[PDB]
Design a protein around this ligand. Structure first.
Ligand SMILES: Nc1ncnc2c1ncn2[C@@H]1O[C@H](COP(=O)(O)OP(=O)(O)O)[C@@H](O)[C@H]1O
Ligand SMILES: Nc1ncnc2c1ncn2[C@@H]1O[C@H](COP(=O)(O)OP(=O)(O)O)[C@@H](O)[C@H]1O
Ligand SMILES: [Mg+2]
Ligand SMILES: [Mg+2]
Lengths: 40, 521, 521
């Protein structure tokens, strides 16, 4: 019956931060495990 | 924003906060630009341009200024369109409705800033508008049978309409002139019959209303000037080179004698047509096309006045003033009929000569000669006269008047407050905001006048709550007086349309999000 | 303006309306930007740079944000300077005072828009501030005779200060650590004597408080690392080439043997000075300057630990902890007052070696080890600990606590309303605006918490008006609770300074109606 939200910038900032963290984790996912290669 | 590009280069998009902020800023700017010209003691503005032909106009109407400014904000464009629609509807209340819309949007801004759902505000505003439109119908005075009171009501309405512009100095005569010009229509709503002729010479005190009709045309050569007891006959034919045949007729002869005979036959046919035109027993011919040299001398040799250059508006005005019909062919003089006029002369107004038509029979149409020193003053006077005629026709077709000055707004605010004082929930904030926006109009009026606005508004509200549901605001001194004693009277349909348009604009702008702008060309 | 130009090319001049509108817009923007970090459940901010090698930091208080952003609006520059002054004074109330100033300016905007003289508004604001400060002085709790109650009040204040930052998860230990560190000063204003060493790595639970002292220096070579019992002595001399003088002496001889004899005499003098240094019977020498090779080997050959490279802050900390005296010359062993210690060793915290000092006699100062993940978290923890220590020292020097949370603001608003409900004139509008701002100050926190702000504000107002001057706001559930039972207690000096700074900023900004900008370089 209430609790209205009129702000959207923090949500977009958090979404962008989560996307950047996921991209970083996917980029560093290659060099992991005993069967991994090296980067140049 | 997402890192992946979606829109094209050169296209911005505002979400919820920035879009609403820009819309509210534009609405506040639009409401404040015209707020200076709202009260009866308002001033005028200057609307100069540079892209056209250095046009300079000075007016007091809000719709004209909003249309000549040329805004670019999307909400400002919607407000300008609403003002134009209102002006085309009745044309009497644009600044008031745009100020009400600006106040409603300003209240909705603070309501949204207080963490309130827009649906509740929309429902509350709809309920307040319904209560206002229900309580407004109960406070209306019906008239029609009593002509003595109807004439006084029309005079008071015309005076109240004219006192809100530049005609406050000559309201004592322009009101009577508009009243006399309205009664000449015999209940007809055709506003095109009233011709407005503006001239550069005298001041506003030299303006009057002709009891007959005037024309700014010239007559032929070797024709009688003043003709007493004439018969005007309006025609519609082509005397200048009568070649209406769309056939492929071409002269393929082999001698100049045949061409001369053909020319003589054409001249004889033209003479026979001219004689058949004058066969009706008339002495004042009027055509809608041009007249050459042969028909001119043919009409002048018999003593028949010929008038040239007449469009559809002039022909309709002459037919409404006299009584004749737009005849042609000229074969049956019994089914044509004529007019009635016993005084035809030419007068000199300033530096030009105009044909005067007096001694008419019917008189459905009339002309008004306006005199001024500046083109801007003449345009303002013409606009004020047109608005007065429009509001008079509207209040005549409505056949019911409502006491103006601010009593209707106070009654609507009191009804909205009484409705909100009985229902709980979050809808009481929207009704309170609507009541505040409705009561802010007398506050702005008193602030533009030059008196204490808060104290007068509080006194009027206390009087309306205690019983005095007919008082208003005295502008001649700055006190509280009865509206039925002074002579301030507005209308009902105009105020209803203003309130409906304001509510619709508020409800439309309230639910606005994601302003997607395309690439400009 | 006038056609004749007076100023130079590129110098603007805002009048009364434009400058006031710009200042109000800037204040509204500053308030909207700073209102996100006010309540205990606030968020953090990212302050990245583009010219200072991209400096990344995370802060919560508004003072650091206002100091790092740096705008060009003078209305915002005044608030930034006020926040910086308040941070240099007490350092606990910047967001609150800037929000109060923004609300006061927003109310003054609508007051000026209602055609009200600024002098009456200023007088009403001054009267409201006087009434609020009188009510705050009348409603105060003085605790100094009891020890357990004073300790409980200090712990509650520290917890309320730490809960507003990122220390709410480890408040069960950081509060006790701050309480133990404050009591070590023996009631002194030596806030700079508490060293805060931050080390990268580890969680927040490993941040333990050492009861002795820690030094990140290195001792000499060929010296014992751990000592069972020693007597630390602080000196202030130059062991690296003791010849720094203004004397323009030079060696003008004619033989290398003379230079060799001079060098041998200098070495013998240095050896005699070193022997006179150890004549006091000490074994832990600490010098604030540099130590070469000869004094190092002389101290190592006798079994005396020599520590070099010591700053003034470390020397003062060692003199305040060990109770030693900074001595020089080394000629009066009877008057030197050596230190005392029974535990000297070296620990391994992370990947560095630090000298561990324990078993001291006095111990006025103490070191705090901070362990975190990133540098921003460690910086935020250090800033929060410094603010907690500052507010604890302030409330200890004041020796009087006042219940905060939202009771003081409601009491001040009620007092202002009661004062306004007795005096007539136009001064009641400024007091009404002040009361509205005082009531809206906790509304921002109530909205940031995530509950119904209007209902809680109405309930608190009803409780304060019915006779209950002890109610407040509950953050653990969202209802109305007692402030004397939960433990929500702030300070009196901080609140008084915040209110006075807000009133001064409002009176300064409201008395400005002209902006004359010069030509930029
Ligand atoms: N002589 C008067 N006495 C009292 N009120 C007036 C008078 N003239 C105008 N008003 C008020 O001024 C308001 C604006 O009138 P007007 O200027 O004619 O319309 P608009 O502002 O839409 O152009 C009306 O609502 C009316 O109540
Ligand atoms: N546990 C708590 N319960 C209720 N209110 C609190 C609590 N902790 C802090 N506050 C509120 O937070 C405000 C101070 O927040 P903070 O941003 O740390 O400092 P500033 O006063 O500079 O804004 C105080 O006015 C206080 O009312
Ligand atoms: Mg009007
Ligand atoms: Mg604080």
């Amino acid at each position: 019956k209430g609790a209205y939200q009129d702000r959207d910038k923090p949500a977009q900032i958090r979404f962008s931060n989560i996307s950047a963290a996921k991209a970083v984790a996917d980029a560093i996912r290659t060099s992991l495990g005993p069967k991994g290669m090296d980067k140049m | 924003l997402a890192p992946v590009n979606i829109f094209k280069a050169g296209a911005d998009e505002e979400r919820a906060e920035t879009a609403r902020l820009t819309s509210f800023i534009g609405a506040i700017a639009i409401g404040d630009l015209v707020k200076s010209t709202l009260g009866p003691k308002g001033m005028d503005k200057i609307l100069l341009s540079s892209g056209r032909d250095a046009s300079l106009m000075v007016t007091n109407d809000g719709a004209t200024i909003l249309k000549n400014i040329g805004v670019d904000n999307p909400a400002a464009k919607v407000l300008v369109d609403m003002s134009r629609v209102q002006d085309d509807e009745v044309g009497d209340g644009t600044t008031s409705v745009t100020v009400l819309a600006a106040e409603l949007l300003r209240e909705a801004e603070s309501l949204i800033a207080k963490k309130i759902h827009p649906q509740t505000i929309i429902a509350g505003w709809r309920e307040a508008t319904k209560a206002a439109r229900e309580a407004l119908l109960s406070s209306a005075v019906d008239h029609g049978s009593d002509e003595v009171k109807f004439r006084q009501d029309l005079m008071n309405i015309a005076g109240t309409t004219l006192s809100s512009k530049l005609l406050t100095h000559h309201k004592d005569h322009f009101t009577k002139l508009a009243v006399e010009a309205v009664l000449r229509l015999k209940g007809s709503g055709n506003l095109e019959a009233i011709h407005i002729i503006k001239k550069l010479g005298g001041s506003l005190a030299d303006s009057y209303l002709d009891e007959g009709f005037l024309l700014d045309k010239k007559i032929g050569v070797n024709q009688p000037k003043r003709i007493e007891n004439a018969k005007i006959l309006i025609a519609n034919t082509g005397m200048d080179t009568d070649k209406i045949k769309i056939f492929g007729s071409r002269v393929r002869v082999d001698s100049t004698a045949k061409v001369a005979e053909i020319e003589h036959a054409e001249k004889e046919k033209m003479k026979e047509k001219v004689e058949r035109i004058l066969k009706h027993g008339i002495n004042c011919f009027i055509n809608r096309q041009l007249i050459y040299n042969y028909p001119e001398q043919l009409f002048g040799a018999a003593g028949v006045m010929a008038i040239e250059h007449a469009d559809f508006a002039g022909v309709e005005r002459l037919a409404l003033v006299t009584g004749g019909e737009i005849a042609s062919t000229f074969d049956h003089p019994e089914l044509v009929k004529l007019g009635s006029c016993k005084l035809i002369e030419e007068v000199m107004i300033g530096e030009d000569k105009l044909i005067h038509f007096s001694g008419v029979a019917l008189g459905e149409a009339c002309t008004i000669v306006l005199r001024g020193a500046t083109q801007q003053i003449l345009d303002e006077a013409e606009r004020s006269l047109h608005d007065a005629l429009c509001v008079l026709a509207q209040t005549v077709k409505d056949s019911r008047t409502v006491y103006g000055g601010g009593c209707s707004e106070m009654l609507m605010a009191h009804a909205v407050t009484q409705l909100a004082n009985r229902t709980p929930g979050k809808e009481a904030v929207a009704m309170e905001s609507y009541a505040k926006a409705l009561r802010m109009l007398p506050t702005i009026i008193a602030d533009n006048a030059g008196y204490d606005s808060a104290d007068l508004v509080a006194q009027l509200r206390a009087a309306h709550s205690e019983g005095n549901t007919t008082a208003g605001l005295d502008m001649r001194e700055g006190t509280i007086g009865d509206m039925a004693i002074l002579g301030i009277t507005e209308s009902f349909q105009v105020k209803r349309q203003v309130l409906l348009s304001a509510a619709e604009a508020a409800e439309v702008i309230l639910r606005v999000d994601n302003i997607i702008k395309a690439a400009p060309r």
